[PDB]
Design a protein around this motif. Structure first.
Motif, short mmCIF file in Angstrom:
data_model
loop_
_atom_site.label_atom_id
_atom_site.label_comp_id
_atom_site.label_asym_id
_atom_site.label_seq_id
_atom_site.Cartn_x
_atom_site.Cartn_y
_atom_site.Cartn_z
N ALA A 1 -38.66 49.16 -38.75
CA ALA A 1 -39.39 48.52 -37.82
C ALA A 1 -38.65 47.27 -37.25
N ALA A 2 -37.37 47.05 -37.47
CA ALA A 2 -36.58 46.02 -36.95
C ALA A 2 -35.70 46.24 -35.63
N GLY A 3 -35.99 45.58 -34.59
CA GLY A 3 -35.20 45.78 -33.45
C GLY A 3 -34.98 44.52 -32.53
N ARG A 4 -34.17 44.74 -31.40
CA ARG A 4 -34.00 43.43 -30.56
C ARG A 4 -35.11 43.19 -29.76
N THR A 5 -35.63 42.07 -30.17
CA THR A 5 -37.00 41.49 -29.40
C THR A 5 -36.63 40.55 -28.15
N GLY A 6 -35.25 40.05 -28.13
CA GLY A 6 -35.01 39.16 -26.94
C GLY A 6 -34.23 39.69 -25.70
N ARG A 7 -34.00 39.29 -24.58
CA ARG A 7 -33.50 39.71 -23.42
C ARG A 7 -32.28 40.90 -23.72
N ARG A 8 -32.44 42.01 -23.06
CA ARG A 8 -31.32 42.82 -23.55
C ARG A 8 -30.13 42.97 -22.42
N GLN A 9 -28.83 42.70 -22.68
CA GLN A 9 -28.01 42.70 -21.79
C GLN A 9 -27.53 44.16 -21.58
N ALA A 10 -27.09 44.51 -20.20
CA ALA A 10 -26.71 45.87 -20.01
C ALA A 10 -25.25 46.06 -20.16
N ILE A 11 -24.72 47.05 -20.33
CA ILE A 11 -23.41 47.36 -20.67
C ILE A 11 -22.90 48.37 -19.45
N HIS A 12 -21.65 47.79 -18.95
CA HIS A 12 -20.97 48.36 -17.80
C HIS A 12 -20.08 49.38 -17.95
N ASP A 13 -19.61 49.46 -19.32
CA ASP A 13 -18.26 50.55 -19.29
C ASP A 13 -18.12 51.18 -20.82
N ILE A 14 -18.59 50.45 -21.55
CA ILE A 14 -18.18 50.74 -23.28
C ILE A 14 -19.50 50.71 -23.87
N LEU A 15 -19.63 51.77 -24.64
CA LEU A 15 -21.13 51.96 -25.48
C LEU A 15 -21.21 50.81 -26.65
N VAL A 16 -20.20 50.75 -27.45
CA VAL A 16 -20.33 49.96 -28.43
C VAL A 16 -19.12 48.79 -28.64
#
Ligand SMILES: NC(=[NH2+])SCc1ccc(Cl)cc1
Ligand SMILES: NC(=[NH2+])SCc1ccc(Cl)cc1
Lengths: 16, 348
Positions: free
Chosen positions: A1-16
């Protein structure tokens, strides 16, 4: 049940 | 299911076709025929948001009006895909026109930066309201979802994919309605496209799997958004992007026990890994979504005309009020004596 709660940055070209 | 009521829906559908035809004509005129200001015409007020490559509240000196100014560091915009994506954003925002899209007012560039000056929407991001309240009621979430459905129907009819739906990018205006901002990933796409981009929690499986994909990724992301609005957290939820990706591709979603069955049915059809089955991607297109039982109370025309009472009106103390936005570090804005990346941004 743990995940990212703050603002989420988008990714432009690389997934990881 | 329908008794009469079907004739009214059918006529409504022909009227949508008529509207979208005129909308495409207006868009193309602006898309094929696009420095409306300079930096010293504005006073810096406050940073409203920050990303890798910032959005500032500014005041136009002459008129005194307030605007949101997105500033892009030209050298920082590479980063590769950044380059093309920044050109996509400006050209799209200057050509579109819809009630739930933020309006671009001016754009210009100098030796160091690109600038896009947009209407200031003082109600704040949906994101912060949602995190503060926890979750929205289903009627509340439905009201916002309907506006996104109509906005995507508009954008997709122009062959535009949006590709970054999330609460961070949805501003609440003075009437409580949505304004979509940040077109940095939006692209005009006739068929498929291949860039790996978006926000992890909202990526459709086909993006993650490095498959050529189409506008159906926006309908997947709508499923994620509706789920997050109604639950308070997104359906694929983990600390690290790699763990998020595994959950997305698995094809398994669990729902809170307070979700209505109508909501769960809609979400199972949006969060559908199989593209031959995903709502928004079938023979009936967007109408599978608009006619779904969860939207049975939605008056689509009334939403578009902004005739529906909003669930929540943000308080505004006055012009230039920033009380509905979080605070950010205030970094210096510096412009070089020497032009940077001039040829690489000639089209901007
Ligand atoms: N990253 C993209 N999605 S296209 C822009 C690009 C620019 C430079 C290079 Cl070397 C590759 C690609
Ligand atoms: N959420 C963002 N993408 S930056 C914050 C912001 C952007 C645009 C406007 Cl009109 C106001 C605030």
């Amino acid at each position: 049940a743990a995940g990212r709660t703050g603002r989420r940055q988008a990714i432009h070209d690389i997934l990881v | 299911h329908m008794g009469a009521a079907a004739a009214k829906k059918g006529s409504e559908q022909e009227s949508v076709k008529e509207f979208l035809a005129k909308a495409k004509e207006e868009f193309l005129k602006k898309w094929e025929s696009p420095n409306t200001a300079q930096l010293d015409h504005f006073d810096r007020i406050k940073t409203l948001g920050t990303g890798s490559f910032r959005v500032m509240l500014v005041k136009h000196k002459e008129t005194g009006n307030h605007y949101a100014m997105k500033i892009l560091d030209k050298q920082k915009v590479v980063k590769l895909k950044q380059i093309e994506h920044t050109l996509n954003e400006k050209r799209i925002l200057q050509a579109v026109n819809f009630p739930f899209l933020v309006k671009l007012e001016f754009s210009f560039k100098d030796n160091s930066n690109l600038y896009m000056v947009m209407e200031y929407v003082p109600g704040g991001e949906m994101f912060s309201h949602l995190r503060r309240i926890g979750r929205f009621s289903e009627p509340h979430a439905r009201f916002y979802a309907a506006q996104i459905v109509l906005t995507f129907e508009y954008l997709h009819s122009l062959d535009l994919i949006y590709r970054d739906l999330k609460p961070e990018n949805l501003l609440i205006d003075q009437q409580g309605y949505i304004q979509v901002t940040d077109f940095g990933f939006a692209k005009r796409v006739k068929g498929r496209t291949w860039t790996l981009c978006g926000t992890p929690e909202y990526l459709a499986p086909e993006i993650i799997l490095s498959k050529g994909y189409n506008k159906a990724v926006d309908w997947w992301a709508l499923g994620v958004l509706i789920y997050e609005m109604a639950a308070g957290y997104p359906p694929f939820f983990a600390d690290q992007p790699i763990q998020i990706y595994e959950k997305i591709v698995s094809g398994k979603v669990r729902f809170p026990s307070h979700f209505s069955s109508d909501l769960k049915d809609l979400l199972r059809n949006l969060l559908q890994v199989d593209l031959t089955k995903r709502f928004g991607n079938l023979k009936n297109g967007v109408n599978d979504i608009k006619n779904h039982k969860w939207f049975a109370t939605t008056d689509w025309i009334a939403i578009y005309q902004r005739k529906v009472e909003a669930p929540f009106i943000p308080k505004f103390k006055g012009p230039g009020d920033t009380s509905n936005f979080d605070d950010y570090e205030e970094e210096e804005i510096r412009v070089s004596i020497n032009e940077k990346c001039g040829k690489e941004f000639t089209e901007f």
